[model samples]
Target: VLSEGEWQLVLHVWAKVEADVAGHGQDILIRLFKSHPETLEKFDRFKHLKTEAEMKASEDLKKHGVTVLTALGAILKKKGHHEAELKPLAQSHATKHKIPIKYLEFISEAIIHVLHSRHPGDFGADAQGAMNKALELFRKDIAAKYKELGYQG
Candidate 1:
């Protein structure tokens, strides 16, 4: 769990990076899929783009990347009040996308890489620890929902 101040620090840094959400989101997805080719299969539209440059230049990729970050912002805002913010997302992924927990973990790692590349100063040791814990708990919550839904994958 995050102390209120820790939560605010994250939110504050997130707000500082607001302008880069779209740009950084694409970078995250690029790094994420590059690291795990299997995750790219879940996004069929980008499956045809076989190279990093191709993926980076795709308009569709940017749109989905923006969507992911937008949803993340909403979830982060409501996490203090609603513990189940992740369940619905898990259900959607399980029933429709069949997104494995590993893919989510991969994305989290890619997100941190992108953030660190852009904001090394702001994301110091303490901030990295807070974000790490937050992402770990978020992954665990998603995994629990997947198990509850009988998603063997």
Candidate 2:
């Protein structure tokens, strides 16, 4: 749960980064892979682009990044009324991909990293905490379904 002020911080920061979705998304994906190399194993295509340079040059990586960032953008658009909106995404990842809870957690880490690096001015302590809290809510939602399906994740 975030305070109203925290929500505003999240919305404000998200708006800035989302405007250059293609650029920031690609950077975020690259950062995720670089910082968490094991995450690459989950993506057959992205697995080959381990290095930062390769990831930046890969069209597939950019496309997937944009897809994820776009979804996040929609979630942010919903603001205080986004719980239900995020359910389908959680369900799909849980059921379709069988994604681990840790991977879901990693998305938040990557997002924070991207936001701070690309738009440091907007990612203060309050903003960071709120983003972390927001992602935790989503992770809990996703993990519940993942467990319901009998997966450890």
Candidate 3:
């Protein structure tokens, strides 16, 4: 299963998509900035940080975001070294920065809660069902983290 932390991201992103399929990630981006305006405080998944506008311009952001969330949820249901495979990129800085993953996580969940409450079943039952796909992607990201850390196992 995904750490409670990961679930928050999946929920938040999907919630945003549920708000506007056309503008899936905008809500999270907007909400994130509003709450954490320092921004420098935010962790960059790719080292290359881009603004919401730049990300929105991405042709596949919506599709990929949705797919990733669905994938992450699915991967969580299986057994075998899930955490070993996916390591938290921000974990290294957590102790030094006193960063709260929960804040980011909750913001995401609130976004999803707001979006889904605003828009009914736009993402559909299967697409949004049980958040399966997100679990799969989270698993892969874990494996990716392990690989990045130079671990063979």
* Top candidate (TM-score): 1
Question: Which digits, one per residue and each the tens of the lDDT, describe model 3 over residues 113-153?
Answer: 44565556553454344344453443345445444544323
TM match of model 3 to true structure: 0.37
Candidate 1 TM-score, C-alpha based: 0.93
Clashing pairs in model 1?
Answer: none
In each prediction, how many residue pairs overlap at the backbone (N, C-alpha, C within less than 3 A)? 0, 0, 23
Instruction: Give lDDT tens digits, candidate 1, residues 1-153.
Output: 889877876776687678677898789999988999988889878899899988877899899988999878777777555466666788898899888888888999998887788888778777777777777877787787788889847
Better of 2 and 3 by TM-score: 2
Q: Evaluate all candidate structures by whole-model CA lDDT and list the values in order.
A: 0.82, 0.78, 0.46
* Ranking of models by TM-score: 1, 2, 3
TM-score of each predicted structure versus truth = 0.93, 0.89, 0.37
Q: Which regions of candidate 2 deviate over 4 angstroms?
A: none
lDDT of 1: 0.82
For candidate 2, the lDDT comes to: 0.78
lDDT of 3: 0.46
